[PDB]
Amino acid sequence: MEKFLVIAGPCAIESEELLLKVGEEIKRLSEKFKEVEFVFKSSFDKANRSSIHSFRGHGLEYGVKALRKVKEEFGLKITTDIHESWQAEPVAEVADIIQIPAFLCRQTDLLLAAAKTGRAVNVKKGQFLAPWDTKNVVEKLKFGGAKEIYLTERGTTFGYNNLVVDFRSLPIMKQWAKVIYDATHSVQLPGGGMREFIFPLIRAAVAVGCDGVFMETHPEPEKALSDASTQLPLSQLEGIIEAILEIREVASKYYETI
Amino acid sequence: EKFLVIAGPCAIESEELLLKVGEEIKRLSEKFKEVEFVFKSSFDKANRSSIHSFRGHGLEYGVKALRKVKEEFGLKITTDIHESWQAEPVAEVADIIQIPAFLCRQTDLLLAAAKTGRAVNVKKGQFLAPWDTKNVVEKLKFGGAKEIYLTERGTTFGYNNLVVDFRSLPIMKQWAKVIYDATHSVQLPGGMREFIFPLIRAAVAVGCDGVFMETHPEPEKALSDASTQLPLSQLEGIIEAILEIREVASKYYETI
Amino acid sequence: MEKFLVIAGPCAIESEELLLKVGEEIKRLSEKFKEVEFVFKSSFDKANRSSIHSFRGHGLEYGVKALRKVKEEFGLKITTDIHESWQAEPVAEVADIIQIPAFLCRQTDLLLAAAKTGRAVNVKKGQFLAPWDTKNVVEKLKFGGAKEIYLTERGTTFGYNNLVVDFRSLPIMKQWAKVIYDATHSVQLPGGGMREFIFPLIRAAVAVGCDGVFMETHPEPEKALSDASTQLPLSQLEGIIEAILEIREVASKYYETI
Amino acid sequence: EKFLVIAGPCAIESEELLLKVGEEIKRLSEKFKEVEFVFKSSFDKANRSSIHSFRGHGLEYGVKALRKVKEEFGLKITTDIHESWQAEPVAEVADIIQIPAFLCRQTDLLLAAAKTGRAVNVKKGQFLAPWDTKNVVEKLKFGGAKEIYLTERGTTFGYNNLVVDFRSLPIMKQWAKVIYDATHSVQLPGGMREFIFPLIRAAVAVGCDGVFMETHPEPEKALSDASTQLPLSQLEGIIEAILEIREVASKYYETI
């Protein structure tokens, strides 16, 4: 079985300190769960918040420098998201995996900018996109030179201010890329979020079969500057990870062949 | 209480077919003692899209064939009703009376079912939000029902498509035992066999009280739900798989 | 141009008196709007309420007798809905148009029970049904002997507790039956309702093109026993009808040919 | 203020095509003096599903061709931007800067557009509820924009389908002028020409401040939105139709 990916970290780079605190914990779990490839995630810019008054971040320069500290202090791989083509090059200096936001999954130039860096690229599936329509997204990355591609399931528009997770997307997308399940954005209520469903839905994802999971986690979610109602309390991370590795193991012999 | 597996051919195509399927379910029944098996088949497909499609052989012949399965194999029975008058005659043989998803809000049908003293399983309508099943349960309690089940079978997602919102499992559990219907949840109304097993794995990882699966020795030849009925020979493997997943996952099912 | 249909009346037969009061007003409008075919509607049983504690009605016998009074006192056509096959025969004694509830639009026996009465049949399109899938519904009625058939647009499931009206359904369904737009149920919030959208959406319906409209109306909606937030104040009916006849007239030369 | 009609070929396939279309719009412009016509064409289809599809001839060539239309015919101009840097160069020719629907929440793009001093039209995202456009308008006001439009273009309805919820027209009007996009609202993402005219009739019966329509002398030969671009010759008839409907219906538009 392939090394399972767990992408995790605070939603936003609130400070270099917050980063070091989560990083410390992620490093501890990586030493325990040696069958997992851990990737530390945090955004240097929440460029698509609903409100002009909401927290965005401290800028690209500061964020890359704080992620670089996490990588240097803990030896952890790094992923962060870009919003315009010009950011691909500077971010690629620290990011092992460049993330493409869900609203931007069809922006050709942004995808090509990420792909020519030589870094892996993970595209969040747009809330508007059918799972079979990710085939062209992967084709655009492969055309642009990307050799390691991920597609992340994060819910689909289901009426107003609600997302539903159609688990059929996991085996469908697996036909053309590795698949990541985003356990924290899939339960958000666009323009909101329900923490009580994070755990059940992530159990469903590993029972269906995916190649990794993505989770935002913060020492104190209620105090977070972004995604306060969906970020997972840091102390709860180890137990969630153990549970998914257990459920994955027992379901794995039944995963179907693409 | 023990995990429920409700299984059988979609339609009572013949007393014979029920006996063949009944035999295999009897067999699995002896192999998996911790599971409560309930044999299912419909005496009438009362809501087919086309007037030219197979409906069945009538309630009399159907109850007779189901009686034969219960007598011959000792299996509990479940079938669905479509109008209030059918509840009492079906209750002579059915341990569980099933309410069709389009009929989940028909007050008299629910009350007629509750009045028989039998257990009632209501398929959640494709139009119903999970929190709105609380009133469904309340109707049945008011009607005297004491063993109540709610079955997840997908929700309307645009035209000719259903999506399973797994958040409904924990929500519905606040007021009834919850069953996951593995075969209708992937059908395309007005489906895809390849998604049956993956989604049933999800349902037990999330946590449910039972699973519902239509099965037929030769699905391609079935007269109803031909595209989604599970081949009978695959049933054992899927049941063992979900008992294994449940065993591990149950440690994590959230309290009520 | 065909005589436009306006189906209207109180949601439920709260009393024979309420019926006579609305009937009086509908009769007055029928004398004014002679280009409209008016049909008086009221249910003898709200058989599918969400709550066991909600108002259902005073029974079939009482309801048919109250509708028969309206027909006899005002000379108005009558429509009411059935819920089980056995009710088709007694209701057909008074109802010119037998209505099939939206949740029951695929119940074969109920449709055949209505069709063999020789009365017109109007089927509410299920909130789960695609517009092209009404073709088989009409085929079932024609097979059962119905010679005058209507399909009513009343919204489609759009996430939880919300309905959306896809106006493309009007020209699609028109391929096989006369089409009615239900102005009051289309704005209800299943398991709720928004009165402010009734008027705009009914203007859209006649600009697209339909063969009639359906509206629930009560002298005092807030006091209604069913659909209190969507029933139209009776005093507002005349002005709505004048507006739709005006918009219909001006749009009509552009209605496309089926 | 007067009713807006924004029209033109989806993509700047060539300075020529724009001139042919510009000529017809100039003509209608003289025929319908109460209407403010705005000529539209995209210099880059930056979000095509396939890497092998037509994107265009670049921003430079595009701004040049649009400048030619404004110089030659005196028509106001609108085109869309895809990244913040494009706002200032596009603002030399565009009276209205268009924000793509997938990019309606990208704060910097909205701010870059507002900073040019031009009017801004934001296509409402297929994922956005109508009440959630209030924050979109607030971003643009904060950015200095004073003439703001919100365009209805359909909402995600299951997979590969959009539905127009007309309730959004009156809701969005509380905070901006509202335009109805008649051609993308009926496209099937990842459409149907037969529904364009019926839905545009609905939009003016409900009440909007303008309509948006892509038009091409020969849609079948277009390099983008070939399935939905309106044949140029049909444009006059549809504009006269909607002015007639609006004239009658406007008596009933609800206050703000």
Ligand SMILES: O=C(O)[C@@H](CO)OP(=O)(O)O
């Ligand atoms: O993970 C996040 O921080 C965001 C941005 O990429 O994800 P999404 O676009 O899926 O909301």
Ligand SMILES: O=C(O)[C@@H](CO)OP(=O)(O)O
């Ligand atoms: O299980 C079935 O036979 C049918 C009828 O009860 O189910 P549903 O109503 O969910 O289609």
Ligand SMILES: O=C(O)[C@@H](CO)OP(=O)(O)O
């Ligand atoms: O008009 C009504 O009173 C009801 C019942 O027929 O309609 P619907 O089923 O469309 O909710």
Ligand SMILES: O=C(O)[C@@H](CO)OP(=O)(O)O
């Ligand atoms: O009108 C268009 O050219 C496109 C781009 O702005 O529209 P939308 O983003 O609505 O697809």
